[PDB]
Design a protein around this ligand. Sequence first.
Ligand SMILES: Cc1cc2nc3c(=O)[nH]c(=O)nc-3n(C[C@H](O)[C@H](O)[C@H](O)COP(=O)(O)O)c2cc1C
Ligand SMILES: CCCCCCCCO[C@@H]1O[C@H](CO)[C@@H](O)[C@H](O)[C@H]1O
Length: 365
Amino acid sequence: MTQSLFQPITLGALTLKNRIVMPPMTRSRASQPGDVANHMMAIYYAQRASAGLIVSEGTQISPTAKGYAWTPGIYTPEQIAGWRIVTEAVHAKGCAIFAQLWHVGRVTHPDNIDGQQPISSSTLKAENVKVFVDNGSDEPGFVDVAVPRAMTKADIAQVIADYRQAALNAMEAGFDGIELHAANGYLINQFIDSEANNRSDEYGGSLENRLRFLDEVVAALVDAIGAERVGVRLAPLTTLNGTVDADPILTYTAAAALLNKHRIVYLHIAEVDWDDAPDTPVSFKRALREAYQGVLIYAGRYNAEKAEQAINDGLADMIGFGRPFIANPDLPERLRHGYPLAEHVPATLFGGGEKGLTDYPTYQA
Ligand SMILES: Cc1cc2nc3c(=O)[nH]c(=O)nc-3n(C[C@H](O)[C@H](O)[C@H](O)COP(=O)(O)O)c2cc1C
Ligand SMILES: CCCCCCCCO[C@@H]1O[C@H](CO)[C@@H](O)[C@H](O)[C@H]1O
Protein backbone atom coordinates (compact mmCIF):
# COMPACT_ATOMS: atom_id res chain seq x y z
CA MET A 1 0.00 0.00 0.00
CA THR A 2 3.18 2.08 0.04
CA GLN A 3 3.25 3.15 3.68
CA SER A 4 7.01 2.65 3.99
CA LEU A 5 7.54 4.05 0.50
CA PHE A 6 6.13 7.33 1.77
CA GLN A 7 8.31 7.57 4.85
CA PRO A 8 11.10 10.17 4.71
CA ILE A 9 14.76 9.19 4.86
CA THR A 10 18.06 10.82 5.70
CA LEU A 11 20.68 10.91 2.96
CA GLY A 12 23.86 12.31 4.44
CA ALA A 13 23.09 15.86 5.52
CA LEU A 14 19.80 15.83 3.59
CA THR A 15 16.32 14.75 4.71
CA LEU A 16 14.36 13.36 1.76
CA LYS A 17 10.57 13.50 1.55
CA ASN A 18 9.99 9.86 0.64
CA ARG A 19 11.73 6.68 -0.53
CA ILE A 20 11.06 7.21 -4.24
CA VAL A 21 13.92 7.86 -6.61
CA MET A 22 13.81 9.16 -10.16
CA PRO A 23 16.72 7.10 -11.52
CA PRO A 24 19.20 8.48 -14.07
CA MET A 25 17.67 8.55 -17.53
CA THR A 26 19.38 9.78 -20.67
CA ARG A 27 16.94 11.86 -22.75
CA SER A 28 19.45 13.41 -25.17
CA ARG A 29 17.85 16.86 -25.10
CA ALA A 30 21.03 18.90 -24.48
CA SER A 31 21.42 22.13 -26.42
CA GLN A 32 23.70 22.25 -29.44
CA PRO A 33 26.37 23.10 -29.91
CA GLY A 34 28.05 22.41 -26.60
CA ASP A 35 25.88 19.63 -25.09
CA VAL A 36 24.43 22.07 -22.58
CA ALA A 37 21.66 21.31 -20.07
CA ASN A 38 18.79 23.70 -20.74
CA HIS A 39 15.36 25.16 -19.99
CA MET A 40 13.29 22.19 -21.09
CA MET A 41 15.44 19.86 -19.01
CA ALA A 42 14.99 22.12 -15.98
CA ILE A 43 11.21 22.01 -16.47
CA TYR A 44 11.36 18.24 -16.99
CA TYR A 45 13.16 17.61 -13.71
CA ALA A 46 11.18 20.19 -11.75
CA GLN A 47 7.96 18.48 -12.89
CA ARG A 48 9.23 15.34 -11.16
CA ALA A 49 10.49 16.97 -7.97
CA SER A 50 7.95 15.15 -5.80
CA ALA A 51 10.44 12.27 -5.90
CA GLY A 52 12.48 11.95 -2.72
CA LEU A 53 15.65 12.03 -4.82
CA ILE A 54 16.33 12.80 -8.46
CA VAL A 55 19.44 11.37 -10.09
CA SER A 56 20.25 13.19 -13.31
CA GLU A 57 20.67 11.48 -16.63
CA GLY A 58 24.26 10.46 -17.25
CA THR A 59 26.40 13.53 -17.83
CA GLN A 60 29.80 13.02 -19.48
CA ILE A 61 32.90 14.10 -17.61
CA SER A 62 34.89 14.91 -20.76
CA PRO A 63 34.63 15.00 -24.58
CA THR A 64 35.70 11.35 -24.84
CA ALA A 65 33.39 10.12 -22.07
CA LYS A 66 30.26 10.58 -24.20
CA GLY A 67 28.43 7.62 -25.70
CA TYR A 68 25.21 9.03 -27.20
CA ALA A 69 24.26 12.06 -29.21
CA TRP A 70 23.05 15.17 -27.39
CA THR A 71 23.70 14.09 -23.82
CA PRO A 72 24.64 16.96 -21.47
CA GLY A 73 28.22 17.39 -20.36
CA ILE A 74 29.49 18.65 -17.01
CA TYR A 75 33.00 19.82 -17.92
CA THR A 76 32.63 23.26 -19.56
CA PRO A 77 31.60 26.49 -17.82
CA GLU A 78 28.45 26.72 -19.96
CA GLN A 79 27.53 23.11 -19.13
CA ILE A 80 27.87 23.82 -15.41
CA ALA A 81 25.65 26.88 -15.83
CA GLY A 82 23.04 24.91 -17.77
CA TRP A 83 22.91 22.37 -14.97
CA ARG A 84 22.56 25.27 -12.50
CA ILE A 85 19.27 26.22 -14.17
CA VAL A 86 18.14 22.64 -13.59
CA THR A 87 19.21 22.41 -9.96
CA GLU A 88 17.72 25.83 -9.17
CA ALA A 89 14.39 24.72 -10.65
CA VAL A 90 14.45 21.42 -8.79
CA HIS A 91 15.46 23.04 -5.51
CA ALA A 92 12.67 25.60 -5.86
CA LYS A 93 10.30 22.62 -5.77
CA GLY A 94 11.96 21.10 -2.72
CA CYS A 95 13.90 18.04 -3.80
CA ALA A 96 17.45 16.72 -3.72
CA ILE A 97 19.28 16.09 -6.98
CA PHE A 98 22.52 14.21 -7.67
CA ALA A 99 24.45 14.41 -10.95
CA GLN A 100 25.30 11.05 -12.51
CA LEU A 101 28.93 11.35 -13.62
CA TRP A 102 29.45 9.36 -16.78
CA HIS A 103 32.27 7.82 -18.77
CA VAL A 104 30.97 5.27 -21.27
CA GLY A 105 34.32 3.75 -22.14
CA ARG A 106 33.89 1.45 -25.14
CA VAL A 107 30.14 1.94 -25.41
CA THR A 108 30.28 4.74 -27.92
CA HIS A 109 31.17 5.58 -31.50
CA PRO A 110 33.91 7.92 -32.78
CA ASP A 111 31.21 10.30 -34.07
CA ASN A 112 30.29 11.03 -30.44
CA ILE A 113 33.83 11.62 -29.21
CA ASP A 114 35.37 13.92 -31.82
CA GLY A 115 36.51 11.07 -34.04
CA GLN A 116 38.60 9.51 -31.29
CA GLN A 117 38.86 5.78 -30.73
CA PRO A 118 36.95 4.71 -27.59
CA ILE A 119 38.91 3.64 -24.51
CA SER A 120 38.34 0.68 -22.20
CA SER A 121 40.06 -1.66 -19.79
CA SER A 122 41.04 -3.76 -22.81
CA THR A 123 40.65 -3.91 -26.60
CA LEU A 124 37.43 -5.93 -26.35
CA LYS A 125 34.50 -4.62 -28.33
CA ALA A 126 31.11 -4.71 -26.60
CA GLU A 127 29.25 -7.47 -28.46
CA ASN A 128 25.77 -6.85 -29.86
CA VAL A 129 25.64 -3.29 -28.59
CA LYS A 130 24.60 -0.11 -30.36
CA VAL A 131 24.61 3.56 -29.44
CA PHE A 132 23.24 6.46 -31.46
CA VAL A 133 24.83 9.44 -33.15
CA ASP A 134 23.85 12.75 -34.75
CA ASN A 135 23.60 12.25 -38.52
CA GLY A 136 22.43 15.58 -39.92
CA SER A 137 18.85 15.19 -38.72
CA ASP A 138 16.91 15.28 -35.47
CA GLU A 139 16.42 11.52 -35.17
CA PRO A 140 18.87 9.27 -33.29
CA GLY A 141 21.01 7.32 -35.73
CA PHE A 142 21.75 3.91 -34.26
CA VAL A 143 25.18 2.47 -34.97
CA ASP A 144 27.37 -0.39 -33.83
CA VAL A 145 29.96 0.48 -31.21
CA ALA A 146 33.65 0.64 -32.14
CA VAL A 147 36.61 -1.46 -30.99
CA PRO A 148 38.31 0.35 -28.08
CA ARG A 149 41.96 0.81 -27.25
CA ALA A 150 43.17 -0.28 -23.80
CA MET A 151 43.76 2.48 -21.27
CA THR A 152 47.32 3.27 -20.26
CA LYS A 153 48.43 4.27 -16.76
CA ALA A 154 48.29 7.88 -17.96
CA ASP A 155 44.76 7.42 -19.30
CA ILE A 156 43.72 6.09 -15.91
CA ALA A 157 45.21 9.12 -14.15
CA GLN A 158 43.46 11.41 -16.64
CA VAL A 159 40.04 9.83 -16.22
CA ILE A 160 40.35 9.91 -12.42
CA ALA A 161 41.25 13.61 -12.69
CA ASP A 162 38.25 14.18 -14.97
CA TYR A 163 35.92 12.44 -12.50
CA ARG A 164 37.34 14.44 -9.60
CA GLN A 165 36.91 17.73 -11.42
CA ALA A 166 33.42 16.73 -12.62
CA ALA A 167 32.39 16.23 -8.98
CA LEU A 168 33.57 19.76 -8.14
CA ASN A 169 31.76 21.01 -11.24
CA ALA A 170 28.58 19.29 -10.05
CA MET A 171 28.83 21.11 -6.74
CA GLU A 172 29.42 24.39 -8.56
CA ALA A 173 26.27 23.63 -10.58
CA GLY A 174 24.28 23.33 -7.36
CA PHE A 175 23.83 19.57 -7.24
CA ASP A 176 23.44 18.02 -3.79
CA GLY A 177 25.83 15.22 -4.68
CA ILE A 178 26.96 12.95 -7.48
CA GLU A 179 26.26 9.38 -8.49
CA LEU A 180 29.16 7.50 -10.05
CA HIS A 181 27.88 5.49 -13.00
CA ALA A 182 29.84 2.27 -12.49
CA ALA A 183 27.03 0.21 -13.99
CA ASN A 184 25.34 -0.82 -17.23
CA GLY A 185 28.51 -1.82 -19.02
CA TYR A 186 30.20 1.55 -19.05
CA LEU A 187 33.86 2.35 -18.34
CA ILE A 188 34.26 1.37 -14.70
CA ASN A 189 32.01 -1.64 -15.28
CA GLN A 190 34.41 -2.63 -18.10
CA PHE A 191 37.11 -3.02 -15.42
CA ILE A 192 34.94 -4.71 -12.78
CA ASP A 193 33.49 -7.54 -14.87
CA SER A 194 35.93 -10.34 -15.58
CA GLU A 195 34.89 -11.08 -19.16
CA ALA A 196 35.37 -7.45 -20.17
CA ASN A 197 38.79 -7.05 -18.55
CA ASN A 198 41.83 -8.86 -19.99
CA ARG A 199 44.42 -6.55 -18.44
CA SER A 200 47.64 -8.07 -17.14
CA ASP A 201 48.61 -5.13 -14.93
CA GLU A 202 47.30 -4.18 -11.49
CA TYR A 203 43.89 -3.23 -12.93
CA GLY A 204 43.04 -6.76 -14.09
CA GLY A 205 44.02 -10.30 -13.19
CA SER A 206 42.41 -10.65 -9.73
CA LEU A 207 39.22 -9.50 -7.97
CA GLU A 208 41.22 -6.87 -6.07
CA ASN A 209 42.75 -5.66 -9.33
CA ARG A 210 39.40 -5.52 -11.14
CA LEU A 211 37.96 -3.35 -8.35
CA ARG A 212 41.02 -1.08 -8.25
CA PHE A 213 39.83 1.50 -10.78
CA LEU A 214 36.47 1.76 -8.98
CA ASP A 215 38.36 2.12 -5.69
CA GLU A 216 40.62 4.88 -6.98
CA VAL A 217 37.85 6.81 -8.73
CA VAL A 218 35.68 6.69 -5.61
CA ALA A 219 38.60 7.73 -3.41
CA ALA A 220 39.08 10.80 -5.61
CA LEU A 221 35.38 11.67 -5.62
CA VAL A 222 35.19 11.38 -1.85
CA ASP A 223 38.36 13.44 -1.46
CA ALA A 224 36.85 16.14 -3.67
CA ILE A 225 33.35 16.53 -2.25
CA GLY A 226 32.87 14.29 0.77
CA ALA A 227 31.53 10.76 1.15
CA GLU A 228 28.15 12.11 2.22
CA ARG A 229 27.72 13.52 -1.29
CA VAL A 230 28.86 10.46 -3.24
CA GLY A 231 26.60 7.64 -4.40
CA VAL A 232 27.62 4.81 -6.74
CA ARG A 233 25.59 2.75 -9.20
CA LEU A 234 26.39 -0.91 -9.95
CA ALA A 235 24.82 -3.57 -12.21
CA PRO A 236 25.83 -6.99 -10.85
CA LEU A 237 23.74 -9.22 -13.09
CA THR A 238 22.54 -7.36 -16.16
CA THR A 239 24.77 -7.79 -19.21
CA LEU A 240 22.91 -5.92 -21.95
CA ASN A 241 25.72 -3.49 -22.75
CA GLY A 242 28.29 -6.24 -22.98
CA THR A 243 29.84 -6.70 -19.56
CA VAL A 244 29.65 -10.11 -17.93
CA ASP A 245 31.39 -11.18 -14.73
CA ALA A 246 32.12 -14.85 -14.04
CA ASP A 247 31.33 -14.76 -10.31
CA PRO A 248 29.08 -11.71 -9.82
CA ILE A 249 27.96 -12.64 -6.32
CA LEU A 250 31.57 -12.57 -5.12
CA THR A 251 32.61 -9.60 -7.24
CA TYR A 252 29.68 -7.42 -6.30
CA THR A 253 29.42 -8.37 -2.64
CA ALA A 254 33.14 -7.46 -2.52
CA ALA A 255 32.47 -4.21 -4.38
CA ALA A 256 29.66 -3.39 -1.97
CA ALA A 257 31.97 -3.96 1.01
CA LEU A 258 34.68 -1.86 -0.62
CA LEU A 259 32.26 1.00 -1.21
CA ASN A 260 31.05 0.61 2.37
CA LYS A 261 34.63 1.21 3.52
CA HIS A 262 34.56 4.52 1.62
CA ARG A 263 31.34 5.35 3.48
CA ILE A 264 29.61 6.44 0.27
CA VAL A 265 26.19 7.85 1.07
CA TYR A 266 24.25 5.41 -1.10
CA LEU A 267 24.67 2.35 -3.28
CA HIS A 268 22.29 2.10 -6.24
CA ILE A 269 21.67 -1.25 -7.88
CA ALA A 270 20.44 -1.20 -11.49
CA GLU A 271 18.44 -4.44 -11.26
CA VAL A 272 16.98 -4.31 -14.76
CA ASP A 273 18.29 -2.61 -17.89
CA TRP A 274 15.57 -2.28 -20.54
CA ASP A 275 14.38 -5.89 -21.00
CA ASP A 276 17.42 -7.48 -19.36
CA ALA A 277 15.81 -8.56 -16.08
CA PRO A 278 17.95 -11.38 -14.65
CA ASP A 279 16.87 -13.29 -11.57
CA THR A 280 18.38 -11.41 -8.64
CA PRO A 281 18.24 -13.82 -5.66
CA VAL A 282 16.92 -12.45 -2.40
CA SER A 283 19.83 -14.18 -0.66
CA PHE A 284 22.17 -12.06 -2.80
CA LYS A 285 20.20 -8.91 -2.04
CA ARG A 286 20.45 -9.67 1.67
CA ALA A 287 24.20 -10.21 1.34
CA LEU A 288 24.50 -6.78 -0.32
CA ARG A 289 22.45 -5.32 2.54
CA GLU A 290 25.07 -6.60 5.00
CA ALA A 291 28.07 -5.71 2.84
CA TYR A 292 26.95 -2.12 2.34
CA GLN A 293 25.28 -0.38 5.26
CA GLY A 294 24.38 3.03 3.90
CA VAL A 295 21.27 3.92 1.88
CA LEU A 296 20.52 1.11 -0.57
CA ILE A 297 18.58 1.93 -3.72
CA TYR A 298 17.21 -0.51 -6.31
CA ALA A 299 15.65 0.27 -9.68
CA GLY A 300 14.23 -2.03 -12.33
CA ARG A 301 10.63 -2.94 -13.12
CA TYR A 302 9.32 -1.97 -9.71
CA ASN A 303 5.68 -1.13 -9.12
CA ALA A 304 4.10 0.13 -5.89
CA GLU A 305 3.63 -3.33 -4.38
CA LYS A 306 7.10 -4.63 -5.20
CA ALA A 307 8.74 -1.40 -4.02
CA GLU A 308 6.90 -1.47 -0.69
CA GLN A 309 7.73 -5.17 -0.27
CA ALA A 310 11.43 -4.66 -0.95
CA ILE A 311 11.60 -1.96 1.71
CA ASN A 312 9.55 -3.89 4.26
CA ASP A 313 11.59 -7.05 3.69
CA GLY A 314 14.70 -5.05 4.58
CA LEU A 315 16.28 -5.30 1.13
CA ALA A 316 16.15 -1.67 0.08
CA ASP A 317 15.80 1.77 1.61
CA MET A 318 14.70 3.53 -1.59
CA ILE A 319 13.31 2.42 -4.91
CA GLY A 320 13.75 4.03 -8.29
CA PHE A 321 11.06 4.04 -10.97
CA GLY A 322 12.45 4.89 -14.38
CA ARG A 323 10.09 4.43 -17.27
CA PRO A 324 7.05 5.20 -15.11
CA PHE A 325 8.61 8.55 -14.13
CA ILE A 326 9.09 9.46 -17.77
CA ALA A 327 5.34 9.30 -18.41
CA ASN A 328 4.05 10.31 -14.98
CA PRO A 329 5.55 13.51 -13.64
CA ASP A 330 3.40 13.05 -10.54
CA LEU A 331 4.36 9.38 -10.17
CA PRO A 332 4.56 9.53 -6.36
CA GLU A 333 1.01 10.83 -6.06
CA ARG A 334 -0.20 8.14 -8.44
CA LEU A 335 1.61 5.36 -6.58
CA ARG A 336 0.16 6.57 -3.27
CA HIS A 337 -3.41 6.76 -4.51
CA GLY A 338 -3.30 3.87 -6.94
CA TYR A 339 -4.08 6.16 -9.88
CA PRO A 340 -3.45 4.53 -13.25
CA LEU A 341 -0.04 5.18 -14.76
CA ALA A 342 0.36 6.59 -18.23
CA GLU A 343 2.86 4.69 -20.39
CA HIS A 344 5.81 6.33 -22.12
CA VAL A 345 6.33 6.59 -25.86
CA PRO A 346 9.62 4.91 -26.89
CA ALA A 347 9.98 7.08 -29.98
CA THR A 348 10.41 10.25 -27.90
CA LEU A 349 12.79 8.92 -25.27
CA PHE A 350 15.84 10.33 -27.07
CA GLY A 351 16.39 13.54 -28.97
CA GLY A 352 13.82 16.06 -30.08
CA GLY A 353 12.36 18.71 -27.81
CA GLU A 354 9.56 19.12 -25.29
CA LYS A 355 7.27 16.59 -26.93
CA GLY A 356 7.54 13.38 -24.97
CA LEU A 357 9.57 15.19 -22.31
CA THR A 358 7.58 17.90 -20.53
CA ASP A 359 4.11 17.36 -21.95
CA TYR A 360 3.08 14.23 -20.08
CA PRO A 361 0.29 15.59 -17.85
CA THR A 362 -0.29 15.15 -14.16
CA TYR A 363 -3.20 12.88 -13.29
CA GLN A 364 -6.72 14.21 -13.85
CA ALA A 365 -9.73 12.02 -13.12
C1 LIG B 1 15.22 6.65 -21.53
C2 LIG B 1 16.13 5.82 -20.63
C3 LIG B 1 17.48 6.30 -20.45
C4 LIG B 1 18.37 5.72 -19.43
N1 LIG B 1 19.58 6.32 -19.21
C5 LIG B 1 20.33 5.86 -18.16
C6 LIG B 1 21.44 6.71 -17.62
O1 LIG B 1 21.79 7.89 -18.22
N2 LIG B 1 22.12 6.20 -16.56
C7 LIG B 1 21.79 5.01 -15.84
O2 LIG B 1 22.48 4.64 -14.96
N3 LIG B 1 20.66 4.28 -16.28
C8 LIG B 1 19.95 4.71 -17.31
N4 LIG B 1 18.73 4.15 -17.59
C9 LIG B 1 18.27 3.00 -16.74
C10 LIG B 1 17.32 3.49 -15.64
O3 LIG B 1 17.96 4.34 -14.69
C11 LIG B 1 16.66 2.35 -14.87
O4 LIG B 1 17.65 1.62 -14.12
C12 LIG B 1 15.95 1.36 -15.77
O5 LIG B 1 15.06 2.04 -16.72
C13 LIG B 1 15.18 0.30 -15.01
O6 LIG B 1 14.09 0.90 -14.23
P1 LIG B 1 12.60 0.91 -14.75
O7 LIG B 1 12.25 -0.53 -15.09
O8 LIG B 1 11.80 1.42 -13.54
O9 LIG B 1 12.49 1.85 -15.90
C14 LIG B 1 17.87 4.59 -18.66
C15 LIG B 1 16.48 4.05 -18.92
C16 LIG B 1 15.61 4.79 -19.77
C17 LIG B 1 14.21 4.13 -19.82
C1 LIG C 1 8.23 31.71 -11.50
C2 LIG C 1 7.91 30.94 -12.77
C3 LIG C 1 9.12 31.01 -13.69
C4 LIG C 1 8.83 30.25 -14.97
C5 LIG C 1 10.05 30.37 -15.88
C6 LIG C 1 9.77 29.65 -17.19
C7 LIG C 1 10.95 29.83 -18.07
C8 LIG C 1 10.70 29.19 -19.46
O1 LIG C 1 11.83 29.47 -20.26
C9 LIG C 1 11.59 28.99 -21.59
O2 LIG C 1 11.45 27.54 -21.62
C10 LIG C 1 11.19 27.08 -22.98
C11 LIG C 1 11.02 25.56 -22.98
O3 LIG C 1 9.91 25.20 -22.15
C12 LIG C 1 12.38 27.45 -23.88
O4 LIG C 1 12.15 27.01 -25.23
C13 LIG C 1 12.58 28.97 -23.90
O5 LIG C 1 13.67 29.45 -24.69
C14 LIG C 1 12.79 29.42 -22.45
O6 LIG C 1 12.94 30.83 -22.39
